[PDB]
Structures are given as C-alpha cells and as structure tokens.
Symmetry: D2
Subunit: 429 residues, 4 copies
C-alpha cells in the first residue's frame, strides 16, 4: 500500500550524484542498457529484488527497468542500505523498502512489500542470501507457479538452494551466478586484493613494507590478500590445509607453515579461510607486541575474539572498529573490525567495478530465465559460459582492451564457434 | 625375442649418474617408492609404457618396478629418447626399445616389442599421445580382454579416447590424468614459465629487460610465459580471443591488443594459442629489424614459417634451431626452432620437478586401476580429486612446506573429511 | 611567559594513547632512548625545534628530553599540528606553542616563544624549512654566538642554507640530514609508495587494477608511486626528461612516453616531478571521462588547477579535498587535494616508521653537533656515512633482520673497519 | 712488425656475421657512428686498446675508427678472446694481437705490439684492468708526455689509478667510467640479473620456483640476482654486513639473516659480496642434499672450494663447469664453475646491450680527453654527468622511449639547462 519506504527522500539528489559517478565504473551494466533498452528483453517481468541497497545496486535496479522489467526492491541486510541510494530509487518511481538500521520485524516487512505489483504478483526472484527465496517457499507457496525463475549470487544462497532441491522443497528453476568466473574472481580475488590494505591503512596508518604478514588460507581471497601485501614489500607467510593450494603458494615463493609456528613471527595476521578456530588464545599469547589481527574471510568465526575479551587486562578503543588489547604477558594486540570483515568495517567494501561484474552476471541470469520459459527445469543450474563470457566482454572497453576475433578458418580448426563459448565447462582459467 | 634395443649400452654409467640427480628433484615419485615398496601394490602388473624415453621417465619406470610391476617400454616420439637414460634402463634388466633418430618403421617395431613379456602379454597401458592405445585396438584387439586399464596424460590422447568411446571402439577403462590440477598446472603454466626464456637465451643470448614482448594467448601457457618475461623487465603485450582470459590479463596490468597492431611494436613474439594463423607474412612485413619469433604452444601450426621460406631473400642458419631471415624490405627476422616448440628445440624442455607431478599422477592412475578393477566402467574418467591432492602432498616435503591438519571440530564445521577431498569438483584453484 | 599554548589540553589522554602506539613503530628513536638515557649526551642542550607538531614529532621531542636536553617547540606549518599530540606534549611539561589553524602572525608568535627558556636562551637549532633558522639570523642575530649547531632535514631548508653560506649570512655550523640515504629513501621512495594509493582510495574508492596510470617523473617519488600502482595491477606509463631515469623505467618494463601522448590514455595521473607545467588545459581537454588527477610531488605548481577553475563549466565538491569538474567538451575530471599533495590532503601522510628514519637522522645530528663543537666549521655538512648506517642499524631489530659482522680477516681483506663505514661517499645504493 | 696476430684469419666471415647481429643490440655505439662519422672528433688520435677481444669489443673498435682514430688492440685476459671476432678486426685492416689461449709471455708481447703506430707512438690509452696503463708507466715511461689521456672501466683499474696518483707514479689524466650510472648499473645489476639464472639453468636445468635461494650480499649484483630469483618463484634470503643494504632488502620483503643460519635452509646459494670466506666447510656440512652453490661476485675467493676438494669423499664432473661432491655426512653439493663466475663459466657473460652501455661510456671518455687537451689535469676524474646522460639517451630509441624536453620556462624554474645535466653530482638514482 505504501509506494516505498526509505529513511529520507530528500537525500535523492546526493544519491543521483553518487549514481552518476558509479555508472562510469560499472560499464558492464551500462553496456546492457546500450544493447537492450530498445528491444526490452525483460518486458513482462516483475522482478522482486533482495540485495544490499547500495549506490551500486541502484545502478543494477535502473538497468533492469531500462530493459523493460517492473522492479520492487528490499535490502538483504539490516545495515547495508545507503539511504541516499535508496532515496534516489524511490524518487525515480521504483518501489524500494529499505533503510540503514532496520529491526528484524521491519526487515521481514520490507521483503513482503516487494511481492505484489500493480498488475499482479512477482514473476522473478533476484536474491543475495536466499531470504526472498526462503520467504516465498515457506510463507507464500501460492506464488511459486507464477514465478519463472530465481537468480542467486551468494555461497549461502546456493548451498541453501541445493538443500531445498535435495529435500523436494524447491519449485522454481534457479541460476547460480556465484560460481561464474567473472563473479567469483571479482568478488573473492580482485575485490579483496584492493580493499584489504585499504582497511588496514584507514584503521592503523601502519607501514606495510618490512613486516611479516601471515595469511591463513590460500584460496581466491588468500591469493589476493597475499599478492597485495607482497606488492607493498611485506614478507608473506601462508597457512593451508589443502595441499594443492599450499603447493600453489610455494611455487610463488611464499613460505608455507602452520599458525602454531607463524604466530611467533607475524606482525600482521589475516584470516581468509571460511573456517572456525584459525587464531586462538594460545596463538595470541605468542604474538609480537602490537600485532595487527584482522579477518577478511568468514563473517566473524575465524578469530577467537571472545578469548581476548575474557583474558586481556586492558581493552582500549582507538577509533571506530579498532580495539587494542593488553594481555597478561604485558603485550598488545590490535584487533580490527571486532574480528568481522576488515574490508567492510574499516574500508568501503568492494570497488564499484567489482560490483559491476557481479550484477552484470545477474542481469544475464534474469534475461536467460525470463526469455527462455521452458528451457530450464526445476533445479540449480550454473550460468552458461557464453553469458559469463559476455559479462567479461562488456567490461573490456573500459579496461582499454582490443579483443581478437577468430577467423572462420581458425574457428573450424579449433572446432568452436567464433562467437564462443571458447572453453569447456571444466576449464579453470 | 631381443632383450632390449638401445643405441649404445656403454652410456649406462652416464644414465645412472643423471638418474641419481633427477631422483632428488622428483620427490613425488620417490615418496611413492617410500610409501609403497613394502606393500608392492602393482605386484602382478605387466605395464606397457609408451612415453618419451628420458631420464625423468626412467625414474617413473623404476618407481613402477619398485611398486612390484613388470614393465616394458618404448618412446612415444622418434627423437625424444635420451640414449644414456635408455642404456641405464637396459643395463638394469628392464626391456626398453628406444633410441634417438628412429625411423617410422623402427618406431612401430619398438612399440610392438613391449606387448609380450616373459610370463605372457601386457595387462595395463601407460600412454602419451594414444599410439600404444591405438596400436592395441586396431592391430592386437585379441589382447584387449586381458588389459585392466589405460592411463593417458596428453590432450591429444584424451580427445582420441573420447572419440573412441563415442564410436564404441574403446574396450578398456581409462583414467584421464591430463586435466588434474597438479598435472595441468606444471605441464602448462610452471613448466613453460621455467623454460621459455631458457630457450630464447640459449638461442640468442639477448637482453630481455627493456624489450616489448608480444605473447599470443593468455591460457595457462600464456600466463606462465607472460609472468616470466615480466619478471625480467620486459613490457608484455597480450593478444586474446577469449573475453575472460583477456580480462584476467588486463587485471594484472598487461596491455591487451591484436596481433595486427602489436606486430609493429614487439621485439619478441611468443605464440601460446594452440591455434592456426597467429603470425603471418602480413605481420612479419611490419616487424622491427631482428625481431625474435618463437612458438611454445602447438607443435608447428601457429607461425607461417612456410611464408618466410617462400618470400625471404635470405635464410641463414645461425646455429642449430636458430634461423635468421632477411625480407624484401631489408629487415631481418630471427626464427627459433623452425616455428616448433622453443623449449624443446632451444632448451631442455620441462625441469624434472614438473615431470614428477605429471608422472606421480601416472603412478596414482596405475595403482587405482590395477587395485580396483570393479570400480571403473569402460570409458574415460578424470583422476579423483583425493589422488590429485595426494600428488601435491607428496611434493610438499621437498618444498619445506608444513601443511595444517584440520581438527575434528573444524572438519565437521566445514562438512568435509579431514583427509579430503577439500574442494568440490567445479573448484578452479 | 605563557608556559605553552595549545587548542585544548583536554586532548592529552588521546595524544598519549597515540604516542604509545607510534613508539612501537619508531624503533630508531626508541633505540636511541635505550642506548643513551644513562649517558645523557644532550645534557645542557636547549634545543628550539620548528617541525610539524605531530604524534611522530612528539616521539622525537621526548627522545631529545630522554637524552638530557631541554627543548621548546613550534610547528613549521600553520595546519600541520595535531592538537592531541601538542596537548600530550604540553601536559608532560614541555613548552610547546602550536595548533591547527594558526594565522601568519600567530605562526611567527609561536616560533618566538621557543627562543628563550627558563635558564636562558637556546643553544641548538632543529629545523624543517629554514624558518627558525631565518628568524634567528634576521631578527635575533644577538643569539647566534650562543648557538652551537643547526640540523636541517628539508630540500627547501638546505638550498636556503647553501645560499646563506654563499652570501656570508650563515653564522652557525649546519648538518644536512636531507641527503642521508636513510632519510631520502624513506621520505621520498618508501613513504610515497605506502601512501599514494591510500590517498586515491580514500578520495575515490576506485578500482586500481586494470587502469592506465600515468606517472610524471621517475625520481625517488616516481619510482615509489610507480611500483605501488603496478603492484595493484595497474598498467603504469612514465614520463621523464632525464635520459638515465627514463632508461631505469624502461629496464623495469614501464612504457616511457610524453604527457602529450599519454594524456589520451591514462585513467589516473600522478605528478612527481617537482616542476611547473606538467598537466595543462591542453592535456585535460584530451582525458578520458572521469580521469583522476593528483599531485604528490611539489607543493602546488605541477598541475594547472587555475585553468580548470577558469575554463570548466562545473566545479562540484564531492567531499573534502575531492573536486569533480565538468569541461566544455562534456567530460569530467576528478581533481584530488586541489592539486596539492594527495598523501596529505586525502590521507595521513607518511607512516610513523618513515619518520622514525628521518627523525633518528635528526637525533644523530643533534648529538654530533652538541658533543663535538670543535669538529664542524661554519657551513653546510652532509651527515657522516657511519651515522647514516647507524640510523639503519637501529631499525633492523624491529624488522627481525640479523646483520652479519665481518671477521677481522674479512675487514682487512676489504680495507675497511668492521664497524664501518662500509661504502665510499659516491656509492649510490 | 707483424701487422696483426690472430689464431685464424679464415674465421673473419663468421666474425662479420656475429658483428652484424650484435650491432643491432648495441645502439649506443651505432648512435656514436651516426652522429660523429663525418665530423670525426677522434681524428689525430692513436688509441692503444687492451680489452677482452670479443664480438662486442669489435663493435667498439670499429666505432672508434669510424670516429677518425687510428686503433691498435690487445686482449686484457688470456682466454676471453673470441677468435672469429679477432679475425674480423684483422681482415678489416686494424692491428689486433689476440687469440684464445695465450701464455703470460705471449700476453705481454701482444700488448707491446699496440704501442707503436705507422706515424708514431700511441697518444691515448683505452684500458680494462690497468695492464696497458701499468706497462707504459713501468716499462715505457718515455711515451707518457705524448699520451693525452687514459679511459678505465674496471674496479681494479680505478683502484690502481688512485694508488699510482697517491704515490706520484701517474703522469697522464685519467677518466674513470667504472662509476658512471650507465656503466655500473648495466655491468653490475641488469647484467647479472639476466645471466645468473641462465648459468644455473644451463648447468643444472633445475626448477627455480619453490626453492629457497640464499644470496650473500645486497649491493648492485645481489639486488639483480635476488630480483631475478624472486621473479621465478624462489623464496630469496639475503645476508649482509651493511645495515643500509640490509634495510633495503627488508623493505622489499626479503628475509635477511646470516649464512650460519641460512646454510641449513637454502636449496641454492649465490655469493655476490666481493669478499673472502662467505661459504665455508662448516656451512657445507649443514646444507641440504644437492644444494647448488655458485659465485657471481668476486673472481674465485668467496667460496672455500679447496675445502670441498680436501674433505669430500666423491667428486664427479657432471658436465663442463659442473661438479658434484659427496661429503662424509653422505650428502651432495653441486658446485658451479669451480667457484668462479657462474655467468662466465656456465653462460655467455653479459648480453650485448649491457656491453653497449659500458663501451659507449668509453667512446665518450676518449672524445672528451682528446677533444679537450688542457681541460683535465693529471689525476683520476669521474666522467661528467652530461656524458653519462648522453650514453643513456643514445639507447632510448632502441628501448622504444620518447623522452620529454623541458620548455625554456620549466628549465628556468628548475634552474638547470634544458640540455642537462639534470641532477647534482651526489644524486643516487
Ligand atoms: N571479505 C569479503 O568481502 C569476502 C569476499 C568474498 C569472500 N569472502 C569469504 O572469504 C572466505 C574464503 O573465500 P575463498 O573464495 O577464498 O574460499 P576458498 O575455498 O577458495 O578458500 C578457502 C581456503 O582456506 C583453506 N583453509 C580452510 N581451513 C583452513 C585452516 N583451518 N587453516 C588454513 N587454511 C584453511 C582451504 O583449504 C581453502 O583453500 C569465505 O568464507 C568467503 O565467504 C569474503
Ligand atoms: N611447449 C610445451 O611443452 C607445451 C606444454 C604444455 C602445453 N603446450 C601447448 O600449448 C598450447 C596452449 O596450451 P594452454 O594450456 O595454454 O591452452 P589454453 O586453452 O589454456 O590457452 C590457449 C589460449 O589461446 C587463446 N587463443 C586461441 N586462439 C587465439 C588466437 N587466434 N589469438 C589469440 N589467442 C588465441 C585461447 O583463448 C586460450 O585462452 C596447447 O597447444 C598445448 O598443447 C605446450
Ligand atoms: N608528497 C610528499 O610528501 C613528498 C615527499 C618527498 C618528496 N616530495 C617531493 O616530490 C618531488 C620529487 O622528489 P624526488 O625525490 O622524486 O625528486 P627527483 O629529482 O629524485 O625526481 C624528480 C624527477 O622528475 C623529473 N622531471 C622533472 N621535470 C619533468 C618534466 N617536466 N616531465 C617529466 N619528468 C620531469 C626529473 O627528471 C626527476 O627525475 C619534490 O618536489 C619533492 O619535494 C614530496
Ligand atoms: N659476475 C660478473 O660478471 C660481475 C659483474 C659485475 C660485478 N661483479 C663483482 O661482484 C662483486 C660485487 O659487486 P657489487 O657492484 O654488487 O658490489 P657492492 O659493493 O655494490 O656489493 C657488495 C655487497 O656485499 C656486502 N658484503 C660484503 N661482505 C659481506 C659478507 N661477508 N657477507 C655478506 N655481505 C657482504 C657489502 O655490504 C656490499 O653491499 C664485486 O666483486 C664485483 O667485482 C661481478
Ligand atoms: C562499508 O561500506 C559498505 C558498502 C557497501 C556494502 C556494505 N555492506 C555489506 C554487508 C555485508 C554483510 N556484505 C557485503 C558484501 C561484500 C561487499 N559487497 C558490496 O560492497 C556491495 N554489495 O552490493 N553493493 C555493494 N557495494 C557485498 C556488504 C558496506
Ligand atoms: C630438449 O631435450 C628434450 C628433453 C626431454 C624431452 C624432449 N622431447 C620431447 C618431445 C616432445 C614432442 N614432447 C615433449 C614433451 C614436452 C616436455 N616434456 C618433457 O620434458 C618430458 N617428458 O618426459 N620427460 C621429460 N623431460 C614432454 C618432449 C627433449
Ligand atoms: C594528513 O595529516 C597529516 C599528518 C601529518 C602531517 C601533516 N602535515 C604535513 C604538512 C606538510 C606541509 N608537510 C608534511 C610533510 C610530508 C610528510 N610528513 C609527515 O607525515 C610528518 N612530518 O612529521 N610528522 C609526520 N607524520 C611531513 C606534513 C598532515
Ligand atoms: C663465456 O663467454 C664469454 C663471453 C665474453 C667474455 C668472456 N670472458 C670474460 C672474462 C673475464 C675475466 N671478465 C669478463 C667480463 C664480465 C663480462 N664481460 C663481457 O661479457 C664482455 N666484456 O667485453 N665484451 C664482452 N662480451 C667482461 C669476461 C666470456
């Protein structure tokens, strides 16, 4: 009944200014507008979205409308909404129900407001976290027959879709864009490579060069963190449980050992594992004075922060999201973002260009499911490679790249189409 | 009937000396010898092997005999045999039929001498290229019922296996070792990173720093080549047809453009594409005087060497595998290895440690098929991830890497066994 | 008469907290405190200091008092004082006259309050810019006979000292600390390497990877800037007027060309030249939409900001020290810090460890002049190499570096003392 | 009386071919020919040269003749002569007295043949090692008044000229080009960076990635070696006696410790110190099995090879300049080039482009002394910066560099000439 609900609609001009700046760093989304604003391949679609209502997501929203869709939006987190961004979407005449600092009750309400449109119920789900997908299946299963497809971009959401399918709960075809090369590499590797040191610097202003930096995990996040630190002249040590990832680290010349050993040597500690119990009290007790300890991996479970609160003799807040503990041995630990994500707590998260790749993935998913009614049966499907390739291609102009086109003869010799896809499904890049 | 056939068995003390050195660089294979010589898991096995008869292969061969197997061998290429390696294998009482400079008839003959042992015929195939596999199926199909498994490590061989399977010709279970992470990364990326510049240096002794180097392709070979050239202070320009691979290069700060533009800029040219018509007369006509041109990708189809032979006013052999042409415009081009593989023509191919990973994959496949017949249907199977991990784990000691073991608690949290596998099959590393 | 003058002495607990953190990053100064607090080598000294009243400078100040000196201080710039640092110095009973947002009259006043102590006038000068040195010589020349030495750390100040000496105006021996290896490398190369991208990120939050970055100049600041940008995966193009510096860039694989050509290519522009007319309207007219332009070299003379103010159709303040202009061609330029120093306008300047090297040079100079009057004629003297080495040696413990000591035999072979100096004065490192 | 003496004058065509190839990698020398072949600034000069009679030095010789000088040449080492190069110079009508494998008696004779020309005695000395300079002063002091100048390019020769001057022996003005930036950087840093791994690879074919490489010394040679090894994925450890050099290493993220510690960890050992007793028996006894030990620094005094010969239980030659010792502990050491220079023993020395910078330095010295009769008094002088700059500038075209020219206004503001020099004499680059 409310046409939108935002904090302050007067912030819309400030939102529009930020939008004007972000658009230039989001060419993937802007290419989609250039290519599809006349043909309007999403005409008919009624997309309910649930995703961090940021400046970046606003560019995504307005891309979808430009492609012909009706769109109604909520946030997937209670603090990630940027109110000026939300105001700008509201003022543009797009139903948005989101503000910074929602209650759990207000959060659910917001999502519920996106389900019904002027002409009828939603017919497409765009989700980050599975909350919109879970709400429809548990609370509003009447609407499932009318929904053509789900796009999902997070690890949690994809893991959740696989369980729903395993248990017979899932009733709508779903495209997983989380495991696209263009999504995964920007969200995990390039993103964290840019923002790790940004967070550490804003938090501490510390010299990186000449320090030992211990990075737990050498997956895509660890790889980027390690590369970043190394570029500044830090000596990086890696820890790993996977022998293949450990081997990769060794072949780049990184020392690889255990946290038990490395806790005695590190000036800076970065956890990127996705796993519990990486840095623990017995590690803290061995650390050099004023060791910087932060997490860029799993939400808040990698570092035993509760140990520091329970065993330290002093806790002094330095600035927002920077606390300095003194231990019984008389040495200090500088803990960043309360053991949560350093890139969100002490910096501005992912750069716009990163979000461009992730959201251009989701625009592709939406078109693919909506444009091909009967193509995808109920289940979780990977985004086809040709669309993953089209995401990358959409950014090349901005990257100052001239891509080569295969000649017909060359394509014949390779046994592939000159428009792609160019690699088999098992190709690792 | 003849117990072996080599060029000169007087080279066995030389071969043995080279073997001893190689063993220390092949910890994967030596770790297999340590772990499995008491249990003799390949006891009973009569393995026919068709694989370049090198020092490295000779270590693989003696690893298979340490594991209990009887083995008989030939090279999979007419020039690839190292005679001293073959002589050392011969003196050790291993029947080996291989020498440098075989004829095509002699090549076939050599493979045919490996099919029948003392106690009877072969029961296992270890292959590189599919020749030994194609010989059995077309010319000795009576031996097929008694053969338990094939292991194949080459792209050529695996494509050939899939076609045999699609057309009902394949009669034996086959493990594909080519697409293992440990095999593919070493054979493609790290191997070429180690040896590209070795070849160029041996051929030319040229300064690399301060040159423009044009690398066609940014797959695993291109990535390795590009990284190597960049380490020496060359400015690397990349050409690509895949949007994803092109973007990957852009994100490491490489210029990405077309060969049409780059041919006027490059001092050095390296083709890594696996494709036809990469460097053409069109391009040669524009190159700087004394541009160095070489191929490390596909055998011989990437550079149009035929054009040079037909259109140049001079062709001068500088040294073996180094030809300097003078064109009608008066400018000179230095072609390496006749447009064939520079790392083989102008250097010593892959370092032993690279082959340790590829051949340790092989031993895993041979154990896996001889030990568990029950397990694999007639068809082409990827090596299981746990064995791929084990290949990597076997090399970590040599690298002085201390791997972390997950606690029971951590493994339960991650929903994985603390012995692995640690990644899903779609994980790209 | 007034015992100190600060903005708000209630900020002393905040200052003290910041000092404690900084001390651990300034091992050079803390090593001086450990080595010299028993012998009090600056006992008797009444040092007037004119140097940015920061947390780092506050550590220097308390180091000088630990060494026995009486000291009185003012900032060498009207905005550079950190009030909390000044308040902490004030509460500690050090007479300090400095605050953020002084007037020019107040600036002079503040320096004039440092000339006369309790027991009498100053006898030593520690200076940054030459202002305290110029004030004494023109306005208090009666105090010159009682002053034993000057230490000066700034290019501006040293040029000024040489002119004073050439024209017979200088009446006190002066050590030049600006051209020490430990000072110059940290203040110019490593400092700017640490903070360039900190400034750009804080200002813009922009992705660096995959951009063309144009760095004008390849001296020590350009080298550092270039290395940093390159580490993030930006493609760095360099402009130079010196053939040697240009060649150095070429040999690391940087493209070297003119601003006239590069202005059409760059996404980011960093001037490091110390020279006028580097970026002009001529260049702005050619730039890509939303090109980021910033200066980290000379104060404000490198970019023609005046042209932008006079010829743009829009100037919008995005945030403090970030202005986005729209030109008559419709394209936008993002100017950082009003063409002034990006690392100061948009970040926190040099990390503490950098200033530790510069200020540990200062302490060495002050000890050297107060302890050995006999030694230095009226004139400008480079810091002796052995003291430059000692500055570096003092920082090695923090870096967990184990230095090798020459044996007596090795030192005799090399014709040097095993305590140094280890290099001739022309050695460039 | 003999017009030349070479090994075989029939090798001249092969020499000329190598010369044609080298000229394209020696633009500095070729630029000198382009600029000066008409004006002929060395007309009148009668230059006796003493320098490794290589293909590269042949380009230098023919550059000097092109500039108007009469030239007669000998080698400065008894094995460095490349006979085909010597043949080509002989056939061109230039008196050359040099062959590979001279006796000490033959060596002296060769130098003596260069002293007298058709029209009179030599009037200029071009020297590498000081042997020609020492011969004239001790044995032929009658000729000293007729000699306008000496150019010298080696550390030994420059150290020798300073002692001669200190003792009153030196009677001719001398230009030291050894300490030019362009000479020193190419001879010490860029040169060894290119050739170290070339030597190790040709000697061993070993994998570099994943190994610990211990580099003793972090001067210009160590810096280049370390950078090279790091680029291949080795983990580099540094040892150092100088705290400034140690600090530099630490700021690039290299572990810095002692050989006593590092001998237990290293897979590869490289000595670059210029000093005795770097690697010793007690280090060898701790080394991992098949550790590779080589020297690229001082001739043959850094490694205690005599210890290996006296204490090892086996010594096996692998190939030329590669010996593998077995110790009493049962482990093996692979020693390269008998502890002499690995880049000369196991590779082809410096690339041509390196020699171009060194020899273009000497052409500048010769012109400078000959063209300015009364400018330089007797003594050792550094080559002026403007000529060092001109050397760099001569190579920029080949490096694909477009150098910027200062505007008159810019030059005024900087207080320098728009033609240079651009830096003060103490500038370190
Ligand atoms: N901060 C962010 O904005 C951000 C962005 C993307 C992803 N992430 C998160 O980062 C985490 C890792 O992401 P990824 O893509 O690198 O995952 P990944 O699976 O590629 O990498 C995780 C690595 O950690 C290793 N590991 C697991 N337990 C370990 C232990 N106890 N000690 C050492 N190593 C251990 C695993 O072997 C694995 O290789 C995930 O939790 C993901 O949600 C955070
Ligand atoms: N030299 C050796 O010993 C050696 C070792 C391993 C592999 N190889 C060979 O190297 C080749 C490449 O192997 P890979 O693993 O890098 O394969 P890949 O598929 O990972 O890389 C090939 C890349 O070339 C690109 N490409 C194709 N045609 C192109 C064109 N016309 N212009 C520009 N780019 C083009 C593709 O996009 C692809 O990214 C194969 O032929 C393989 O057999 C050689
Ligand atoms: N941001 C800071 O806090 C900070 C710190 C230290 C130094 N600086 C300043 O940075 C500037 C440079 O310092 P540096 O140590 O690198 O000096 P430098 O002399 O080592 O480097 C300056 C380089 O700029 C080049 N150059 C001059 N005019 C040029 C032109 N028109 N085009 C292209 N290149 C040109 C010169 O050839 C020189 O190599 C100085 O003004 C210095 O005061 C700033
Ligand atoms: N192989 C070649 O072709 C080649 C080329 C150029 C120079 N060189 C030689 O290389 C050597 C070094 O040249 P450079 O220009 O690097 O000299 P440098 O003085 O710049 O470097 C030598 C470094 O070794 C350090 N050192 C001295 N004794 C040490 C010890 N016992 N342990 C550890 N470090 C120690 C010194 O502190 C110094 O920094 C010289 O002997 C030079 O003649 C060889
Ligand atoms: C500190 O400033 C910010 C700025 C933006 C968002 C946030 N808040 C979160 C909270 C949580 C729990 N997760 C995320 C992820 C990881 C980074 N992402 C984005 O940056 C992003 N996603 O959509 N637009 C974007 N921009 C999504 C971001 C905080
Ligand atoms: C230059 O001297 C040598 C040395 C070794 C082998 C060769 N010959 C070939 C020929 C062909 C056609 N293909 C190969 C591939 C590519 C790299 N490989 C190995 O290096 C390798 N494979 O088994 N042991 C190994 N070592 C296999 C090698 C030539
Ligand atoms: C952004 O907040 C800050 C923080 C610190 C200082 C400033 N202000 C200036 C102003 C001017 C004109 N010059 C400088 C130089 C360059 C770098 N320096 C230091 O960082 C530094 N010097 O003493 N302690 C230090 N810290 C000295 C710094 C501003
Ligand atoms: C193995 O092949 C070669 C090739 C060339 C020369 C040598 N021999 C020596 C011997 C000694 C004692 N010193 C040197 C120095 C260091 C390297 N230098 C040159 O390369 C070089 N100098 O003049 N033209 C050149 N080319 C000079 C070279 C060996």
């Amino acid at each position: 009944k409310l046409p939108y609900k935002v904090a302050d609609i007067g912030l819309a001009a400030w939102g529009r200014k930020a939008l004007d700046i972000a658009e230039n760093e989001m060419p993937g989304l802007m290419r989609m507008r250039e290519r599809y604003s006349a043909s309007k391949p999403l005409k008919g679609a009624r997309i309910a979205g649930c995703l961090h209502m940021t400046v970046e997501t606003a560019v995504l929203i307005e891309t979808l409308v430009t492609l012909g869709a009706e769109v109604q939006w909520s946030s997937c987190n209670i603090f990630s909404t940027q109110d000026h961004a939300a105001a700008a979407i509201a003022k543009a005449g797009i139903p948005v129900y989101a503000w910074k600092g929602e209650t759990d009750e207000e959060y659910l309400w917001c999502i519920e407001q996106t389900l019904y449109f002027k002409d009828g119920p939603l017919n497409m789900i765009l989700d980050d976290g599975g909350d919109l997908t879970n709400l429809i299946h548990t609370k509003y299963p009447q609407l499932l027959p009318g929904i053509r497809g789900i796009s999902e971009e997070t690890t949690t959401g994809v893991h959740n879709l696989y369980k729903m399918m395993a248990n017979g709960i899932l009733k709508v075809p779903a495209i997983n864009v989380n495991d696209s090369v263009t999504k995964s590499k920007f969200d995990n590797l390039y993103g964290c490579r840019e923002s790790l040191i940004d967070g550490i610097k804003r938090a501490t202003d510390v010299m990186i060069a000449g320090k030992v930096a211990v990075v737990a995990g050498y997956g895509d996040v660890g790889k980027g963190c390690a590369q970043a630190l190394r570029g500044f002249g830090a000596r990086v040590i890696i820890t790993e449980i996977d022998p293949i990832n450990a081997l990769q680290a060794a072949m780049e010349g990184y020392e690889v050992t255990t946290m038990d050993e490395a806790c005695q040597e590190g000036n800076i500690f970065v956890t990127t594992t996705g796993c519990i119990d990486i840095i623990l009290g017995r590690h803290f007790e061995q650390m050099k004075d004023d060791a910087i300890v932060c997490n860029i991996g799993h939400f808040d479970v990698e570092i035993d922060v509760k140990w520091l609160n329970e065993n330290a003799v002093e806790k002094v807040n330095i600035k927002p999201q920077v606390d300095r503990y003194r231990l019984k041995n008389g040495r200090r630990i500088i803990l960043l973002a309360e053991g949560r994500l350093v890139n969100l707590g002490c910096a501005m998260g992912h750069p716009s260009f990163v979000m461009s790749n992730s959201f251009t993935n989701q625009v592709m998913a939406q078109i693919e499911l909506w444009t091909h009614p009967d193509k995808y049966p109920v289940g979780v499907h990977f985004l086809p490679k040709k669309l993953d390739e089209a995401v990358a291609e959409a950014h090349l102009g901005k990257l100052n790249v001239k891509l080569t086109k295969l000649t017909e003869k060359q394509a014949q010799y390779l046994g592939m189409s000159c428009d792609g896809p160019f690699k088999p499904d098992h190709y690792r890049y």
